[PDB]
Amino acid sequence: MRLSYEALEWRTPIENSTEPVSLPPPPPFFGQERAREALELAIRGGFHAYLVGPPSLGKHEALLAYLSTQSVETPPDLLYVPLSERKVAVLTLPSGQEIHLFQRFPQARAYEALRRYAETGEPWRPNLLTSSSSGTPPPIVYEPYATAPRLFGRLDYLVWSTNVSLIRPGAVHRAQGGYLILDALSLKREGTWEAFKRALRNGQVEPVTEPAPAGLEVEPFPIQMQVILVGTPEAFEGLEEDPAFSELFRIRAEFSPTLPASPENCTALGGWLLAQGFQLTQGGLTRLYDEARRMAEQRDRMDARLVEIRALAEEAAVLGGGLLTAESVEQAIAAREHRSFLSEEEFLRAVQEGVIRLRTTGRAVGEVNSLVVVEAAPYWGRPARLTARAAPGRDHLISIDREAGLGGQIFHKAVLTLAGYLRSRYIEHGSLPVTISLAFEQNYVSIEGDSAGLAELVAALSAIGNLPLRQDLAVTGAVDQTGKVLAVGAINAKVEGFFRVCKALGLSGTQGVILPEANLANLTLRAEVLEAVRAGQFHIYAVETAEQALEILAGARMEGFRGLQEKIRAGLEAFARLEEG
Amino acid sequence: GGWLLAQGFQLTQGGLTRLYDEARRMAEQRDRMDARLVEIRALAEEAAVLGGGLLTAESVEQAIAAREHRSFLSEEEFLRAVQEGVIRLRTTGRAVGEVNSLVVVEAAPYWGRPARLTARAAPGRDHLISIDR
Amino acid sequence: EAGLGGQIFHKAVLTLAGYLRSRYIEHGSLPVTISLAFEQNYVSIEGDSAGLAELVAALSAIGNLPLRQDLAVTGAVDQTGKVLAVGAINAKVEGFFRVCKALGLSGTQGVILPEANLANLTLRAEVLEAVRA
Amino acid sequence: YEPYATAPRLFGRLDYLVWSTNVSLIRPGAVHRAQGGYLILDALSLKREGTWEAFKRALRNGQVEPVTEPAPAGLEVEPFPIQMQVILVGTPEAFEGLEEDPAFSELFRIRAEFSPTLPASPENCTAL
Ligand SMILES: *[B]([O])([O])[C]([C][C]([C])[C])[N]C(=O)[C]([C][C]([C])[C])[N]C(=O)[C]([C][C]([C])[C])[N]C(=O)O[C]C1=[C][C]=[C][C]=[C]1
Numbered sequence: 001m002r003l004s005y006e007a008l009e010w011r012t013p014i015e016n017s018t019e020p021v022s023l024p025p026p027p028p029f030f031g032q033e034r035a036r037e038a039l040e041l042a043i044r045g046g047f048h049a050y051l052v053g054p055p056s057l058g059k060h061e062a063l064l065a066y067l068s069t070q071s072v073e074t075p076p077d078l079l080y081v082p083l084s085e086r087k088v089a090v091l092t093l094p095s096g097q098e099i100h101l102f103q104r105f106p107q108a109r110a111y112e113a114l115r116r117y118a119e120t121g122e123p124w125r126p127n128l129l130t131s132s133s134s135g136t137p138p139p140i141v142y143e144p145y146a147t148a149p150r151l152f153g154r155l156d157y158l159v160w161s162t163n164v165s166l167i168r169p170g171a172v173h174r175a176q177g178g179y180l181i182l183d184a185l186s187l188k189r190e191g192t193w194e195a196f197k198r199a200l201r202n203g204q205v206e207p208v209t210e211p212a213p214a215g216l217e218v219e220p221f222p223i224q225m226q227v228i229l230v231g232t233p234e235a236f237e238g239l240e241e242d243p244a245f246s247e248l249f250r251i252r253a254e255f256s257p258t259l260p261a262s263p264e265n266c267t268a269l270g271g272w273l274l275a276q277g278f279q280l281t282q283g284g285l286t287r288l289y290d291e292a293r294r295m296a297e298q299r300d301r302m303d304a305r306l307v308e309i310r311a312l313a314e315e316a317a318v319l320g321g322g323l324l325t326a327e328s329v330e331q332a333i334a335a336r337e338h339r340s341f342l343s344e345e346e347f348l349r350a351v352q353e354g355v356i357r358l359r360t361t362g363r364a365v366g367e368v369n370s371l372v373v374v375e376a377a378p379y380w381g382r383p384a385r386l387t388a389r390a391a392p393g394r395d396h397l398i399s400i401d402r403e404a405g406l407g408g409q410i411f412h413k414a415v416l417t418l419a420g421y422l423r424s425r426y427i428e429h430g431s432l433p434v435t436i437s438l439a440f441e442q443n444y445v446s447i448e449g450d451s452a453g454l455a456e457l458v459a460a461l462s463a464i465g466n467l468p469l470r471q472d473l474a475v476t477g478a479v480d481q482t483g484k485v486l487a488v489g490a491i492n493a494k495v496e497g498f499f500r501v502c503k504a505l506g507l508s509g510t511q512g513v514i515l516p517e518a519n520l521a522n523l524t525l526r527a528e529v530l531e532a533v534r535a536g537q538f539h540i541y542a543v544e545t546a547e548q549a550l551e552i553l554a555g556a557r558m559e560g561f562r563g564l565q566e567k568i569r570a571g572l573e574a575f576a577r578l579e580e581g
Numbered sequence: 582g583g584w585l586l587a588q589g590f591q592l593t594q595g596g597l598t599r600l601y602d603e604a605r606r607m608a609e610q611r612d613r614m615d616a617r618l619v620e621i622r623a624l625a626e627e628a629a630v631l632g633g634g635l636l637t638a639e640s641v642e643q644a645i646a647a648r649e650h651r652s653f654l655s656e657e658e659f660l661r662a663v664q665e666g667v668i669r670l671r672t673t674g675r676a677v678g679e680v681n682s683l684v685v686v687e688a689a690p691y692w693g694r695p696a697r698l699t700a701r702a703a704p705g706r707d708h709l710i711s712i713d714r
Numbered sequence: 715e716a717g718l719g720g721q722i723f724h725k726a727v728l729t730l731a732g733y734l735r736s737r738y739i740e741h742g743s744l745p746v747t748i749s750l751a752f753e754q755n756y757v758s759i760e761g762d763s764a765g766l767a768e769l770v771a772a773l774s775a776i777g778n779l780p781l782r783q784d785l786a787v788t789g790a791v792d793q794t795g796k797v798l799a800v801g802a803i804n805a806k807v808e809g810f811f812r813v814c815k816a817l818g819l820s821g822t823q824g825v826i827l828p829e830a831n832l833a834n835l836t837l838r839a840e841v842l843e844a845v846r847a
Numbered sequence: 848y849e850p851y852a853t854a855p856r857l858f859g860r861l862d863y864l865v866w867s868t869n870v871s872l873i874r875p876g877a878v879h880r881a882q883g884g885y886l887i888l889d890a891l892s893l894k895r896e897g898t899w900e901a902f903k904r905a906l907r908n909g910q911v912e913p914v915t916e917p918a919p920a921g922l923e924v925e926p927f928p929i930q931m932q933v934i935l936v937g938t939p940e941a942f943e944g945l946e947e948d949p950a951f952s953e954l955f956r957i958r959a960e961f962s963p964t965l966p967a968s969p970e971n972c973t974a975l
């Protein structure tokens with residue numbers, strides 16, 4: 001099918017573009033149902049939990065604002081008192097009562113043991129770590145740098161003695177009765193994971209010393225706190241492998257990477273941006289909300305990384321003189337593309353130069369513009385010339401790039417899948433009477449993935465049938481063994497990448513891309529491409545099957561003979577007779 | 582039951598039975614029951630919260646479904662993709678040389694999924710090709 | 715085969731075989747084994763810029779066709795036998811010119827190269843003069 | 848412009864006057880010298896000197912800690928809000944080590960890339 005400009009347009013209509021936006025701030029966790037509820041369970045329950053999600057989602061700021069709304073019992077007076085002249089204990093009192101100093105501190109049993117100094121002339125002070133007014137909002141402590149001294153506190157040395165009073169508190173102490181938030185990465189990096197389990201599992205909390213001369217034994221004590229860990233899916237694996245982890249950290253609070261694209265979340269993003277201090281106009285909200293849809297390559301979802309959105313917004317603001325407008329956002333996007341365009345501008349020059357040989361008009365046998373992406377941020381796409389050559393052979397399909405060690409495993413798997421199709425689909429001669437060689441003509445680099453399977457197979461079929469294919473249409477799609485075409489990824493980059501090549505060489509009017517029907521909802525194409533489609537200057541075909549892609553390329557149908565199919569048969573028969581006479 | 586009570590739980594007969602059955606379930610054994618007292622306790626502490634301090638059949642069934650919810654993101658993404666046609670699967674009809682096999686994905690908690698499997702045959706010299714291998 | 719060629723070198727060799735096999739089909743499969751060597755090389759060689767020299771050499775061995783040894787060759791080839799741009803062109807050309815000048819110029823010496831690399835020719839004066847002469 | 852990115856050179860240092868210390872024994876670091884203005888560093892150097900994480904903590908969290916020796920009593924010194932624009936300089940390759948760190952792109956949003964070559968024009972001959 002042909003996809004009309006109307007089918008392609010996915011942007012949000014804008015009305016009153018300059019109007020200021022006025023909106024109240026969404027609560028912490030909007031569009032994050034699962035993570036909110038996990039976190040709620042963990043709070044009502046006293047459980048430790050972990051916050052997991054990809055980078056730049058704003059997991060931290062949401063957690064902190066969410067904890068600021070919590071309320072609980074004002075935190076006890078918290079302290080170290082001596083038991084010996086070499087020993088110290090952690091104690092809790094009911095609050096504020098330690099401005100004091102039987103006696104009326106009966107909770108402090110042992111400190112006996114300040115008991116008989118002048119039965120000798122045998123010639124100290126109880127220390128406070130924390131105290132406080134209210135359990136609203138609770139202690140929330142966020143130590144992003146998880147070193148031992150920062151977690152467990154420290155012992156300093158006053159010349160060379162020490163006593164309770166020289167003991168400095170650590171995050172763990174500051175968080176008693178409340179929250180300690182840590183980064184998964186940091187505990188890993190700082191090799192503090194085991195020592196921190198011992199603090200949770202066994203009450204073990206040891207202030208750091210220097211490599212002498214006399215230390216202080218300090219007893220375990222019961223730990224009062226809820227700890228939340230934050231990091232990525234990947235940040236966690238190192239941890240999970242430790243059966244202790246799941247035991248200690250029962251509640252997973254997972255963020256989704258994407259949100260439904262709904263009015264409520266557009267509206268929510270609007271208030272969220274306003275609370276952040278932006279001066280936002282309706283046009284500036286719509287473009288940003290659409291870029292979020294675009295960032296997720298999902299017409300119906302919107303990318304959930306609030307921090308990425310904010311960062312782009314801060315760029316648009318500068319370009320709009322402090323005002324966040326539809327134009328300033330469209331310009332801050334185009335400037336980011338400009339800032340990273342050097343490699344592409346070199347490619348286009350080379351192509352224009354004939355240094356990279358590409359065709360974008362005309363026809364040729366056994367050649368096709370496939371589409372690749374180059375694997376560094378921001379993942380530009382480009383056409384890559386693909387050739388297929390056929391000769392009398394013993395059912396051999398040669399992937400040249402694989403054989404030379406450039407193809408990856410998935411690339412290899414696609415090549416095998418297509419050979420499964422060819423061998424099985426054409427059987428009159430018994431085994432296939434041809435050797436077919438496939439190359440990505442100017443490639444010097446590893447290529448990996450299955451998204452060139454459709455280009456490979458039409459190229460094969462063209463070489464077998466001697467069938468000239470349109471070079472003004474590029475191809476992307478995976479295939480299965482039955483020759484159905486399967487969805488692939490990075491589609492916007494692929495299409496926009498052939499459009500740049502065509503525009504650099506000068507548009508014919510007939511250029512386009514063929515792609516899987518399966519990827520219709522991923523098309524969130526940039527304006528210039530959409531306009532060109534609206535103008536009849538560029539075209540998008542979507543298919544379900546390899547043979548559909550072939551009929552568009554060879555400008556003919558598989559049957560209604562004079563079809564393509566009888567010519568493919570006639571090619572195979574000829575290759576069969578050459579293989580035995 | 583007595584072990585849970587000594588631990589301080591307020592346990593009802595329905596809350597014992599569901600937990601004892603989850604233990605059977607955890608061991609994938611109708612006739613055996615998983616012996617990890619600590620796992621059982623940890624689940625029970627979740628059910629208790631959901632039952633307001635009381636450990637009931639419902640609170641256990643709900644504390645189980647919530648654990649599945651807390652780890653369902655990857656599955657909810659898979660189902661969306663399948664519904665979308667992004668993963669091509671068939672669940673009605675017939676076809677030659679195709680079958681829904683079943684796999685599990687190897688991270689806790691080990692969700693299972695169907696995975697489309699195709700077999701193609703041609704005139705050949707006794708060759709069976711495992712493409713994934 | 716002896717482990718001196720790199721991956722891109724190998725890829726060029728395969729590309730040219732793709733061309734040969736496909737371009738000459740009367741006999742079915744190609745009725746020849748063709749061996750190619752870089753006669754005094756002891757070291758890794760890598761890149762596709764010898765594909766054009768390799769293929770004319772193949773064609774000469776097949777046809778028994780004597781080739782001019784006063785012209786050197788550089789260029790890559792694709793499967794259709796088109797010649798493709800390569801790199802370090804000034805060094806290549808000026809390098810055959812030194813060899814020829816050291817052995818004493820015939821008057822007829824030169825280099826064949828891809829048309830695609832015309833804009834890369836920024837040849838040193840002595841080479842330009844010799845062309846002028 | 849601190850081309851040698853060691854901790855003491857970035858964050859400054861604490862010296863010890865016999866064995867005590869106090870505010871007045873605290874020496875400034877590049878980061879302090881650059882407040883309100885520009886700090887230029889080499890990508891390679893932060894890599895080489897293993898100072899990348901400590902420098903993120905200075906930007907991300909205000910964390911700026913003057914170096915001590917392996918005792919006996921230190922000084923706690925609070926974070927403070929950082930006033931500066933930092934520019935990093937290096938090669939395409941010098942950056943990859945860094946980019947792999949999702950923190951990098953977050954902290955260092957604006958890529959300023961030089962082209963390797965210029966058009967050959969009269970204006971650039973004249974400019975040269
Ligand atoms: B498809 O699955 O999307 C597709 C199939 C290919 C075209 C046969 N694969 C890709 O586009 C992959 C993308 C993925 C690995 C990020 N691209 C590559 O493997 C590319 C291919 C070349 C032709 C650009 N290889 C690559 O990125 O690796 C080497 C390299 C990376 C960055 C810069 C320079 C070289």
Ligand SMILES: *[B]([O])([O])[C]([C][C]([C])[C])[N]C(=O)[C]([C][C]([C])[C])[N]C(=O)[C]([C][C]([C])[C])[N]C(=O)O[C]C1=[C][C]=[C][C]=[C]1
Pocket residue numbers: 682683684685686687688696
């Ligand atoms: B059967 O023996 O149970 C079965 C046979 C398979 C389907 C042919 N094997 C599995 O289900 C194994 C389970 C075991 C290794 C834990 N699963 C896998 O090997 C899976 C298979 C895919 C299709 C899900 N591979 C896998 O888990 O590895 C990669 C990976 C793991 C986790 C997340 C993402 C990728």
